[model samples]
Target: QGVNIYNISAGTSVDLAAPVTTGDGVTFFSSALNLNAGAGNPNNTTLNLFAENGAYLLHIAFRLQENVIIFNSRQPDGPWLVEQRVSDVANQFAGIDGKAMVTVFDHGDKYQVVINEKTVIQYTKQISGLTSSLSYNATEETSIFSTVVEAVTYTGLA
Candidate 1:
């Protein structure tokens, strides 16, 4: 249970305040915002992880077509891997001041995406190609309440 939780207060617009030096995996929960839904309809709000040199590791977010949430894994140069899409209910997403949570479990070769603690998407792949030194990040207009990361692989053991 090597987890570190952070309460990303209101109006956190920067990419990263400080590297989450506590662990490797992460979970980000944010209050939704209207961000122009930039290019191809991506989430206006984003919670990301990057290598020390600015390479991407994980992007777990919402705003993918009105109430849809998506999880993406980093790739070399091409498009990132579209790991999962959770579109449970329309208009159930980040409404005005509404909240959403995304958790990424890096269990070595087995990765898992969990939304709101109930739904999950499991993957057999690992982010082996990406750099090991990962850092947490967030965008503007989003309110992050908490974040947790662990240095060891997740075992679902509380």
Candidate 2:
């Protein structure tokens, strides 16, 4: 409904977005982003990335109803990192019907979350670097609109 480039459907599980990007970071785009009350009171729709050994790395949980986005991560050891939060997402995605574009930038010592080309949140790294793939779980009511990951690293002078 918004901007489904891939014309994806619901319950479409993802394995990897890219072929294992190792540069600055990657970008994610989603379309047909319509949600209902069935998504839950908080509405926990998330996009996740994990380590090779299936270690928990990072995820961006979009809570639609509350108009908030929760950023989470963890270290290689134990215990989870401090949860991050961003409020008033409605102002950010006011234009798009549901098509949202997000970019995750691995800034060495920290991580950056860019939605619709806007830098929303930046926090310290829980593990180390993004060395695996991106995974997303779509619910029944929700349909997989589109999520294409593109590597956007600074190669060199062109």
Candidate 3:
């Protein structure tokens, strides 16, 4: 990977840390996740990515009660893209002690959303925009986590 932009602990809400830099292409990773069906909507939990300049890039969701995972994003001025969802049979982190990984790669033209080491979806959209002021929100549906978030450059295989 090119220079690592950030590697920091995540919080229940929007993470306090932010990536140092952003570019046309981006790579994001969430590791050491400890997911569970919480008291508040135990059925689902969400992790959202946002740019400092106010642009949402990705939404990673864990549907615990349903045992599914959903990935989604959209163009800055466009509608939300169709969600790429996976069932427990294919979900690497389903109903287990969550230390698994979830990653998203934006290659300026296409997007790759990965679960653990598996590539689940490759989508095409207007990904030519740059990202900045990166932060993570891990508390949607009251999702709880003890994880780390990494922002790496895409040039060197991030």
Candidate 4:
């Protein structure tokens, strides 16, 4: 197991267009951050995972019109494939003072979205693709309390 940690103070914007992967193991990434403004409208803050060659695999996005957290994916080719939303919070900016623990992991044929260590959503893909890099970006200003990325080669531990 290998881990990379990124720490960003409040009132800073994070955008990583090009990122480096940790290893050949499955990609595991988590972030504890907040958008500056509250729900309703495009905060443009994004946490994403990409392929080694720069293909978009999955992303957690805060949109402009809605006060919800969106978990979505896309094909290497183009276009967003699917999305799931979390609207329990007041809006996109609900976790401003508080921290949100958002996680994305690729488990072979499966993909998972976890918030606060709970698996809120899971799905299957037609083909098993590996994700190599982790990134964060925001069109508007945002703050990242902390971010963690891990590349793990898991073994049966039973």
Any runs in candidate 2 off by more than 4 Å, and if so which? Answer: 1-22, 35-37, 75-79, 142-158
Off by over 4 Å in 3: 8-31, 39-45, 48-53, 74-81, 94-98, 126-128, 140-148, 154-158
> Candidate 4 deviates by what RMSD?
6.3
Which candidate, 1 or 4, would have the higher TM-score against the true structure? 4
| Residue-by-residue lDDT tens digits, candidate 4, 54-95 | 556666665544556677677667677666677744343243
TM-score for each of the candidates: 0.51, 0.69, 0.60, 0.59
- Rank the candidate models, highest lDDT first: 2, 3, 4, 1
Candidate 1 has a TM-score of 0.51
What C-alpha lDDT does candidate 1 achieve relative to the native structure? Answer: 0.46
State in Å the error of residue 149, model 4: 10
How far residue 82's Cα lies from its native spot in candidate 2, in Å, is 1.2
lDDT of 4 at 117: 47
Global local distance difference test of model 2: 0.56
1 versus 3: better lDDT goes to: 3
lDDT of 3 by residue, 1-158 (tens): 44545664444333323242232344455544544435434324455555454455666666666667666766556677777767772247544444555566665566666665677777554333444545455544344444456655444342
RMSD per model, one decimal: 6.7, 5.8, 5.0, 6.3
Candidate 3: residue pairs that collide: 52-133
* Candidate 2 residue lDDT tens string, 1-158: 11112222333424443333334565566655554424433444566666766555676777766667778775545666778888975566566665776677666676777777578887666666544556555465532234433323222111
Better of 2 and 4 by lDDT: 2
Which scores better on lDDT, 3 or 4? 3
Per-candidate clash tally? 0, 1, 1, 6
